[PDB]
Design a protein around this ligand. Structure first.
Ligand SMILES: NC(=O)C1=CN([C@@H]2O[C@H](COP(=O)(O)OP(=O)(O)OC[C@H]3O[C@@H](n4cnc5c(N)ncnc54)[C@H](OP(=O)(O)O)[C@@H]3O)[C@@H](O)[C@H]2O)C=CC1
Ligand SMILES: CCCCCCCCCCCCCC(=O)SCCNC(=O)CCNC(=O)[C@@H](O)C(C)(C)COP(=O)(O)O
Ligand code: SF4
Ligand code: SF4
Ligand code: SF4
Ligand code: SF4
Ligand code: SF4
Lengths: 208, 112, 93, 364, 145, 112, 176, 96, 328, 118, 156
């Protein structure tokens, strides 16, 4: 619609992104599984996990796709899927002033090829993904805990990991050191059920 | 499914033994480096205990990842990335022993 | 008011019992107790008499009060009480 | 790993400030998640809020009111002054020059008062909220902003007088931590890091957000890629920020400060206590929160330390499913070893400063 | 609905009616949905509730001062879409978002009514019916509640 | 002559036209090795032919840079090198083959 | 659109080279910087005399939380608990029961200041302006237990600071 | 600032600039802390007619992402966007 | 009256229902006792007479509102009353190895314990844990041991069900027994009466004593029983000191301080007690009765004496000293 | 059967003792909306919640007290429980039966359905 | 008595010296460190009170925990604290240092630095204003002024 409340939408960028998505799909039919452009003009390419390195290399070196900047590499944990972890690569093409997202899937066991060869920035991002979610990255130069404690056990950002964790720290005089003890909260984190019983967005309705 | 490192359980057991050798040989140095009060036997007993904890695994993929995690802990221990408390965390000391007898649990609390 | 133990009773009706071990926390320190009981204070406030069947109270000060609520005064025995303020209003007989 | 006095392998160990902010965000409503972003980069506060606000607004498919957008840019450039002051002064302080730190920090104290005048808190403001800004500027705030900006240029020049031409400062910065342009792009560097090597990239220009397209400024570009050029770039960014601030102070439009949607922005307190609909929305927005349409986005702004992006994932509820935060410092510190190769220990200190590493954002 | 109001006039106020020691009644909030009347007439079987008057002055409730006595009276609290009818014991105790819900079975009678035990901070706050078409449908006895 | 490219690590090429022509010929040969049906070969050959034609047509370096719209001519040379390496890697990967495997069930369904 | 920092070739004029060598040998720029600091010496120091002199503050300042009362003397808090919900740090713990009169009066209003982030969402959410962050920033304690504020503590804080709190609200309610 | 003329001259000479023109300390140009009561305006949707929320519900006008291509059941080369134009050197100050 | 149902998992935030007033908590044994009560989740009332700064070490040993510090005076019965009024358990650890200006061995080991026991009974305290010494004897020459036994009898008289514990030369990190021997450097070589060849001592580990005290509180039959905390092995004084200097990397040189107004380095009674062989009482319950298994000195010796290393024995050479011969 | 229990990091006590309940949340009787009752959810057994002595706040040691995982289908929840080795109890979704409704029946001629009041 | 008078006066002299020349170490961990710098900034100028920022923890008297003490950083804090010489005082600045603040329920945040190190003065706020931190230091100075270490030794 119109008026200040509604956000203005640019259709030109939408058309450009759709065309380029088709371009990428045609060039890489072996790996590209699905191409989507969001209504807010964000092209997303879904690729089979085996194509992490080829697709990224194409999107980085190709003359008409000069995405030479790995903006952010992250993971989304959806426990309702067999391949719960979804590895998402956010790219930036300075030459064409555009961005693209490469989304792949992985299990808790299936390794994913490291993209350090494609982007050197991928090192620490993949370390974080392994540390927080537990997605092993094959051929990684140094895959180790980057954010958790040295002796920490478990992957915190997993949806099945408790928010407060399983262990807590304190200083004990008898052992003269900081010791790890089972977590005991003086005030339990009060879970608030806020989801309304009435549907909010008809456009995103999943038919039964 | 693509194997992480080992295609078969026998290959995985080879990796497990390699890790066990490294941990077994590192324990004496670790006690010296962090000036731990545990004995070399105690550390090696803990290493064997930790390995035996994950002795029910049958999937080579899971065994591979367990070895990778075991390697990572060894790397931190060798590189002194861990601190004295971190090494001692394996030896739960301050934590009071929780009994297993039903009658004892019955007295202790509402523990299921 | 003060409990038999000697501990002043809060407006929330709370007073550590004699057998309560927690009473030791006030051994050398005072027990913070507010000395303006709200329930007593409104009881002091007089009951307004407004001829209109329905009156509206905002708590005073407009935007500095409470959401405006309309009170009905049909009940003769009872006096219309503000939901937020607690002020009582009556219809003159 | 030092060869006596030469750095061979500088392994950066992070996580000393890893507080699990991203996971905590998932357990809280969108409004409740906003204060977290203030903490992420505790040097540039309102800039962090703007990036999160833009991401939520994009998913909400709403547009902040024109006045709020100008207010966001005005305080955004004020925020950029805060960080650049902090970056340069603390970098010089570690190098040894201690006088400039105190000189510019009083100006930083003055700017903190501007935060407190408009939000009520000195550092963490939570003023830029998804949908606009929390409140309108207090009468007289803009006038004081003009007074500060008028005399601020002299302060920057005094900083240059003590550092820029000083030979000792140049020796500690010139030809230190040189990054090739191609390496910077591949290593995911952003902000001053790219501009320092000559890469002509600036989100405020290439991908304009809010009313940055309606302001005129110049992007400082380095020539050698050393710490000294990046030091000059950060100083010039402060100067160009004053240029933007003056424009905003002269173009601030009349209007509301929040999107006129009571299902996204809470209604005014007077309206809440009068209108039945307003009270309902005021109740729901603060208890449940606004439901964001299902989707995902990666909105990034040209934050003072570089590109600050938020990968917001909405499941259709009032609490985000996944909120990955792109910290510009994270990538920069990852490339510290590459920059530190073939340098001395003291050079490492300078390289840390030129990357403007705040471990709050790095550890998220 | 919309996000603002155009009502520049004064709102109405309705005198509340006592219907018993269990259901706190604030008829000012009633939206004249007639759910309570229909429920009392059909499910409960007690023809006490009804509409008095016509137009905007139509008040819902017993014309005379009478207590609505039923073994299933408590359900009228649930059926009421607005907070006109509220549980007198549960009144002012807690909010819905904080309460944790635990599905359970009632033991007061041998019906086996499925109940939802709303507990906050490890304290039973209220008991709500759980849908079971075969046993309790959507209603529970006043004792159970 | 251009004193410097501005970008650190990028050097001015004294013979940019000849270098671009040689690189484009190499790229074209490598694409010729690629199967014709492959979209990569078709599109890349189109792009390279356009760029090569413009390079041969315009002898002025600045006008050529403006014509190609790839930035400084050294940047265009770098782009050509990257494209050539990518073409070889594509010959290895053969991404023109059919899809490896369809996504398992609703692996790309949001919201849940 | 873009400005070239540095990127300035040095002139090789013998006069220019002479002046550059003069700068190098005679340490001119160091003297210039030294003079700048000397100028800073003779300026007026910007230090305020704490606590005899207090720093500037705005009426919107957020500090010690405080529970307010109506002019009659009744607690404004009507136990809606939405401030508990909005609190991003889950610091407010509210338990309410019908008062002897029958109004919604909380039996427990506990906020641990050691967990509160002083965001101000609580005062923006309260529909009766009951919980309002006060102007007092100097309330440091010596024991952790003191930070955890009871309902009685909040009521006393409100009673103590009411004059200033009311004045500040009167000076800012129009903006809100 | 309350400094003697001699001190002012010495200060300015040492700095090389007229510091009295722009003194960092704030004296009287500050705005009065006490200000007249404001009257903030209303938004574009504060109207009694033609204000139906259906015509201004941007939140509900969002649509699921459009699927351009799905593996489940001569074109010219296409770039993601038109190539970025070269930035132009500043006219206020080309070289710092 | 003050009976609290224990609730929780036994952690820092749990409730063990033990309101305890640990007299003399600012001491070697006191710290460990408070730590055990704190880690279980007990309301540890700490009566202190020293500066509050000296009591800061006890602050992190408990959760919020679990360690309460209140000033007490051994010469004031009222102070004892206000500190044990709400306590269900009172533990008495007050004892100084050297007499002071205003406190003599009689006052510290008779008068103060008796006042605590009498007040506790009047207050209704359920259990009292007095801490005597194994070598305490009514006719023992040393005033320390003699006064301790005198107070022990008075404790039983005032508190009939008092659980009196008699440890023997507790050793630990902040102990005055192992560290005292390893401090013979100040006293020339190793001053040993008759080369300490007729003295066999039975040292007990600090944690073992503290855990026994906590176990005694829980134990329902411990009330009224005089426990005697003995060590795992009996060591010859000469062998023990030789072992001490050995693990401490100290040259073993086998070979007035009461005057010192500041804490005396050595006491005449301490010298007598050091050269006095520990008694052996087989008629009293021990650690095994409370379930605590005695920990050998050898295992915990390095933790107390490695910190006393000179140059290169905590590293480099790191020669392992074998266990010293035990006279068992 | 995937065995991720060793890789989860969950303590053994909270791997065996836990009793996961797979179920579809019931509709709150107070409201009439059914949007909440559309996705399967997984919750853990409730355990002791004692009172903190200082303030009275409820304290717990259960680390998984607040863990609620939504799942598209029951099979997904079952598989996830099996992967993590948690004993899982599944409650089949209860969908209200379609009910015949007639406004005319309110004014029946010879039926009980005839309403006394409107 | 005369002995008490002499001891009391000497104790006051010792108390004055320490409270007047407190040397704090900046254990800046998070956002609160920025406000701590603003305390040392010209407007407030902690040095004016004799409180000079001593980088060396071995020559410090006050440890100002400013920020969120994570589990990874927790051992370092205690180890630095025990390497401080005595008398040593700990001032907790910020809700995160006090009781975890915004990250109280985080999986890798210590629920208050009080667990790791004993704290003397708690400065509330997020971040506490520089005056509030300055107020806390002055409160610590008054706390030191009340200390009677010598008097208790004499009366022992
Ligand atoms: N190896 C050993 O130490 C053994 C000792 N014991 C006895 O068991 C107890 C263990 O004491 P421990 O914890 O090691 O402490 P220490 O003997 O090392 O220090 C003395 C302790 O007693 C307190 N104290 C001493 N005199 C007084 C007094 N006049 N007024 C108040 N408090 C006083 C001290 O508190 P403050 O510092 O505040 O005065 C401190 O807690 C003592 O009673 C001791 O005699 C028995 C067997 C072995
Ligand atoms: C200080 C002490 C530190 C101890 C650290 C020790 C560790 O690293 S624990 C990680 C060890 N985990 C493993 O080795 C996984 C082994 N997984 C298995 O399935 C094995 O049991 C095998 C493969 C069945 C082999 O079993 P056997 O050795 O034949 O029976
Ligand atoms: S159910 Fe409630 S809203 Fe409906 S008529 Fe009855 S009282 Fe009114
Ligand atoms: S909560 Fe519902 S019933 Fe109660 S006043 Fe608000 S809209 Fe009316
Ligand atoms: S928001 Fe206001 S009225 Fe509601 S509970 Fe909090 S203080 Fe009371
Ligand atoms: S100001 Fe913020 S942190 Fe403090 S009580 Fe209100 S919502 Fe909670
Ligand atoms: S208390 Fe607030 S400002 Fe201080 S470290 Fe914690 S979040 Fe940051």
């Amino acid at each position: 619609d119109t008026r200040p409340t509604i956000r203005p939408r640019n259709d030109v960028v939408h058309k450009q992104l759709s065309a380029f998505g088709q371009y990428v799909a045609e060039i890489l039919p072996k790996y590209v599984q699905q191409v989507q452009v969001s209504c807010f003009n964000e092209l997303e390419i879904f690729i089979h996990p085996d194509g992490v390195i080829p697709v990224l290399t194409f999107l980085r070196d190709h003359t008409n796709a000069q995405f030479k900047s790995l903006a952010d590499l992250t993971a989304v944990d959806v426990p309702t899927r067999q391949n719960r972890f979804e590895i998402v690569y956010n790219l930036l093409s300075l030459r064409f002033n555009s961005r693209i997202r490469v989304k792949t899937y992985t299990d808790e066991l299936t390794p994913i090829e490291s993209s350090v060869t494609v982007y050197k920035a991928a090192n620490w991002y993949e370390r974080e993904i392994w540390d927080m979610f537990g997605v092993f990255f094959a051929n990684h130069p140094d895959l180790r805990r980057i954010l958790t404690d040295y002796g920490f056990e478990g992957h915190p950002f997993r949806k099945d990991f408790p928010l407060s964790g399983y262990v807590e720290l304190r200083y004990d005089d008898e052992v003269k050191r900081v010791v790890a003890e089972p977590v005991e909260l003086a005030q339990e984190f009060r879970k608030f059920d806020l989801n309304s019983p009435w549907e909010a967005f008809p456009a995103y309705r999943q038919p039964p | 499914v693509k194997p992480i490192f080992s295609r078969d359980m026998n290959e995985a057991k080879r990796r497990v033994r390699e890790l066990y050798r490294a941990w077994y040989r590192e324990v004496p140095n670790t006690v010296h480096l962090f000036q731990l009060d545990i004995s070399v036997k105690q550390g090696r007993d803990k290493v064997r205990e930790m390995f035996m904890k994950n002795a029910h695994v049958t999937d080579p993929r899971v065994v591979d990842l367990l070895v990778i995690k075991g390697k990572m802990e060894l790397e931190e221990t060798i590189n002194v990335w861990k601190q004295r408390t971190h090494i001692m965390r394996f030896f739960h000391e301050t934590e009071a022993p929780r009994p297993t007898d039903f009658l004892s649990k019955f007295y202790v609390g509402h523990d299921p | 008011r003060t409990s038999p133990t000697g501990e002043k009773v809060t407006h929330t009706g709370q007073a550590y019992d004699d057998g309560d071990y927690r009473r030791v926390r006030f051994s050398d320190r005072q027990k913070e107790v507010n000395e303006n009981f709200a329930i007593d204070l409104i009881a002091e406030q007089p009951v307004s008499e407004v001829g209109s069947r329905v009156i509206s109270c905002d708590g005073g000060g407009g935007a500095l009060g409470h959401p405006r609520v309309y009170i009905n005064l049909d009940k003769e025995t009872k006096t219309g009480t503000c939901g937020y303020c607690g002020l009582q209003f009556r219809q003159p007989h | 790993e030092l060869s006596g006095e030469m750095v061979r392998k500088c392994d950066p160990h992070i996580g000393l400030l890893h507080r699990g902010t991203e996971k905590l965000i998932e357990y809280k409503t969108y409004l409740q998640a906003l204060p977290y972003f203030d903490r992420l980069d505790y040097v540039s506060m309102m800039c962090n809020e703007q990036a999160y606000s833009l991401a939520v607004e994009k998913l909400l498919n709403i547009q902040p009111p024109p006045r709020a957008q100008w207010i966001r840019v005005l305080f955004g450039e004020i925020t950029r002054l805060l960080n650049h002051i902090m970056a340069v002064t603390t970098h010089a302080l570690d190098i040894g020059a201690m006088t400039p730190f105190f000189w510019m920090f009083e100006e930083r104290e003055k700017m903190f008062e501007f935060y407190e005048r408009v939000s009520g808190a000195r550092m963490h403001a939570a003023y830029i909220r998804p949908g606009g800004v929390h409140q309108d500027l207090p009468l007289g705030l803009l006038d004081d902003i003009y007074e500060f900006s008028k005399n601020f240029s002299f302060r920057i020049d005094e900083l240059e007088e003590m550092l820029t031409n000083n030979r000792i400062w140049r020796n500690r910065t010139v030809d230190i931590g040189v990054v090739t342009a191609e390496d910077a792009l591949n290593y995911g560097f952003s902000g001053v890091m790219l501009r320092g090597s000559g890469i002509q990239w600036d989100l405020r220009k290439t991908q304009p957000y809010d009313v940055y397209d309606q302001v005129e400024f110049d992007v400082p570009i380095g020539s050698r890629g050393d710490c000294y050029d990046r030091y000059l770039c950060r100083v010039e960014e402060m100067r160009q920020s004053l240029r933007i601030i003056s424009q905003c102070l002269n173009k601030m439009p009349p209007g509301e400060i929040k999107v006129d949607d009571a299902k996204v922005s809470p209604p005014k307190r007077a309206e809440m206590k009068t209108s039945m609909e307003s009270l309902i929305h005021h109740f729901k927005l603060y208890t449940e929160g606004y439901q964001v349409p299902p989707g995902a986005t990666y909105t990034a702004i040209e934050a003072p330390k570089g590109e600050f992006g938020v990968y917001l994932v909405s499941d259709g509820s009032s609490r985000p499913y996944r909120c990955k935060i792109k910290a510009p410092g994270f990538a920069h510190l990852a490339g510290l070893d590459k920059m530190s190769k073939g340098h001395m220990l003291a050079d490492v200190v300078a390289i840390i400063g030129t990357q403007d590493i705040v471990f709050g954002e790095v550890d998220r | 609905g919309s996000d603002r109001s155009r009502f520049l006039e004064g709102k109405r106020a309705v005198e509340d009616k006592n219907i018993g020691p269990l259901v706190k009644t604030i008829m000012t909030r009633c939206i004249q949905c007639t759910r309570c009347i229909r429920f009392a007439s059909e499910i409960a079987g007690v023809d006490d509730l009804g509409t008095t008057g016509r137009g905007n002055d139509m008040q819902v409730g017993t014309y005379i001062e009478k207590m609505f006595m039923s073994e299933l009276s408590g359900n009228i609290i649930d059926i009421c879409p607005v907070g006109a009818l509220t549980s007198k014991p549960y009144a002012f105790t807690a909010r819905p978002w904080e309460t944790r819900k635990t599905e359970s079975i009632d033991v007061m009678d041998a019906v086996g009514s499925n109940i939802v035990v709303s507990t906050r901070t490890g304290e039973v706050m209220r008991i709500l019916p759980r849908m079971h078409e075969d046993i309790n449908e959507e209603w529970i006895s006043d004792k159970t509640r | 002559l251009k004193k410097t490219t501005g970008l650190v690590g990028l050097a001015v090429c004294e013979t940019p036209h000849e270098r671009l022509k040689i690189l484009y010929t190499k790229i074209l040969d490598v694409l010729g090795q690629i199967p014709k049906n492959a979209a990569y070969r078709k599109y890349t050959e189109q792009i390279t032919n356009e760029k090569l034609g413009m390079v041969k047509a315009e002898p002025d370096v600045k006008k050529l840079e403006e014509q190609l719209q790839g930035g400084q001519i050294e940047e265009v040379i770098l782009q050509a090198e990257n494209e050539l390496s990518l073409a070889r890697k594509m010959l290895r990967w053969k991404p023109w083959e059919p899809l490896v495997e369809e996504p398992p069930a609703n692996q790309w369904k949001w919201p849940i | 659109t873009y400005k070239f920092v540095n990127m300035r070739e040095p002139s090789m004029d013998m006069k220019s080279v002479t002046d550059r060598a003069a700068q190098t040998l005679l340490w001119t720029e160091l003297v210039r910087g030294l003079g700048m600091t000397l100028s800073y010496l003779f300026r007026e120091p910007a230090t305020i005399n704490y606590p005899f002199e207090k720093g500037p503050l705005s009426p919107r300042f957020r500090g010690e939380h405080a529970l307010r009362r109506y002019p009659s003397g009744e607690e404004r808090c009507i136990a809606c608990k939405l401030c508990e919900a909005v609190c991003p740090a889950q610091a407010i713990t509210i338990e309410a029961e019908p008062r002897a009169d029958g109004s919604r009066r909380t039996t427990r209003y506990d906020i641990d200041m050691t967990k509160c982030i002083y965001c101000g969402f609580c005062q923006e959410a309260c529909p009766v302006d009951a919980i309002v962050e006060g102007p007092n920033f100097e309330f440091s304690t010596e024991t952790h237990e003191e930070l955890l504020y009871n309902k009685e503590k909040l009521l006393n804080n409100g009673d103590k600071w009411e004059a200033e709190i009311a004045a500040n609200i009167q000076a800012d309610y129009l903006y809100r | 600032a309350s400094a003697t003329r001699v001190i002012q001259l010495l200060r300015n000479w040492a700095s090389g600039r007229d510091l009295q023109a722009k003194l960092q300390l704030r004296y009287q140009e500050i705005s009065k802390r006490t200000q007249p009561p404001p009257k903030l305006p209303v938004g574009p949707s504060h109207k009694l007619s033609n204000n139906y929320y259906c015509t201004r519900d941007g939140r509900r006008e969002a649509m699921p992402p459009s699927i351009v291509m799905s593996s489940q059941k001569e074109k010219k080369a296409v770039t993601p966007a038109p190539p970025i134009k070269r930035w132009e050197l500043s006219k206020d100050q080309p070289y710092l | 009256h003050h009976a609290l149902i224990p609730h929780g998992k036994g952690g820092r935030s749990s409730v063990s229902g033990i309101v305890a007033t640990v007299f003399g908590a600012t001491g070697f044994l006191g710290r460990y006792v408070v730590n055990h009560l704190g880690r279980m989740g007990s309301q540890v009332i700490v009566p202190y007479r020293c500066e509050p700064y000296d009591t800061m070490h006890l602050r992190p040993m408990g959760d919020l509102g679990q360690i309460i510090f209140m000033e007490w005076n051994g010469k004031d019965k009222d102070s004892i009353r206000k500190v044990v009024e709400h306590s269900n358990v009172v533990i008495n650890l007050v004892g100084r190895e050297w007499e002071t200006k205003n406190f003599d061995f009689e006052d510290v080991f008779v008068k103060i314990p008796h006042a605590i026991a009498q007040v506790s009974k009047e207050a209704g305290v359920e259990k009292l844990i007095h801490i005597s010494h194994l070598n305490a004897d009514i006719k023992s020459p040393s005033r320390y041991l003699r006064s301790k036994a005198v107070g022990e009898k008075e404790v039983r008289a005032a508190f009939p069900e008092a659980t009196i514990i008699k440890p023997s030369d507790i050793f630990g990190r902040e102990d005055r027994f192992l560290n005292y021997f390893a401090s013979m450097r100040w006293f020339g070589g190793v001053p040993l009466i008759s080369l300490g060849k007729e003295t066999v001592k039975q040292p007990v580990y600090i944690v073992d004593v503290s855990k026994g005290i906590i176990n005694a509180i829980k134990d329902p039959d411990a009330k009224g029983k005089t426990f005697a905390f003995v060590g795992p092995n009996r060591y010859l004084l000469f062998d023990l000191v030789q072992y001490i200097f050995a693990v401490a990397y100290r040259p073993f040189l086998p070979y007035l301080f009461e005057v010192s107004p500041f804490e005396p380095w050595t006491t005449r009674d301490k010298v007598e007690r050091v050269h006095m062989s520990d008694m052996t009482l087989p008629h009293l319950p021990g650690l095994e009765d409370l379930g605590i298994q005695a920990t050998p000195l050898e295992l915990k010796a390095i933790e107390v004496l490695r910190r006393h290393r000179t140059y290169r024995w905590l590293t480099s050479e790191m020669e392992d000293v074998k266990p010293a011969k035990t006279v068992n | 059967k995937l065995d991720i229990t060793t890789l989860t990091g969950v303590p053994e006590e909270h791997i065996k003792t836990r009793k996961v309940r797979i179920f579809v949340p019931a509709r709150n009787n107070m409201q009439s909306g059914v949007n909440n009752t559309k996705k399967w959810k997984m919750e853990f057994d409730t355990r002791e919640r004692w009172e903190n002595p200082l303030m009275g706040w409820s304290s717990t040691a259960d680390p998984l007290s607040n863990l609620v995982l939504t799942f598209s289908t029951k099979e997904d929840a079952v598989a996830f429980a099996e992967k993590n080795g948690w004993s899982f109890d599944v409650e089949e979704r209860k969908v209200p039966k379609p009910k015949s409704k007639s406004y005319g029946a309110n004014f029946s001629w010879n039926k009980r359905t005839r309403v006394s009041t409107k | 008595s005369r002995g008490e008078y002499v001891v009391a006066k000497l104790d006051d002299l010792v108390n004055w010296a320490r409270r007047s020349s407190l040397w704090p170490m900046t254990f800046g961990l998070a956002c609160c460190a920025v406000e701590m710098m603003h305390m040392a900034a010209p407007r407030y100028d902690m040095d004016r009170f004799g409180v000079v920022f001593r980088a060396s923890p071995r020559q410090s008297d006050v440890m100002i925990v400013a920020g969120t003490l994570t589990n990874k950083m927790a051992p370092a804090l205690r180890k630095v604290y025990d390497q401080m010489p005595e008398p040593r005082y700990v001032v907790s600045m910020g809700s995160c240092a006090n009781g975890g603040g915004y990250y109280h329920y985080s999986y890798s945040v210590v629920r208050g630095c009080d667990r790791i190190v004993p704290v003397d003065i708690y400065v509330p706020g997020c971040p506490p204003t520089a005056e509030a931190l300055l107020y806390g230091i002055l409160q610590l100075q008054r706390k030191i002024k009340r200390e009677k270490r010598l008097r208790i030794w004499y009366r022992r």
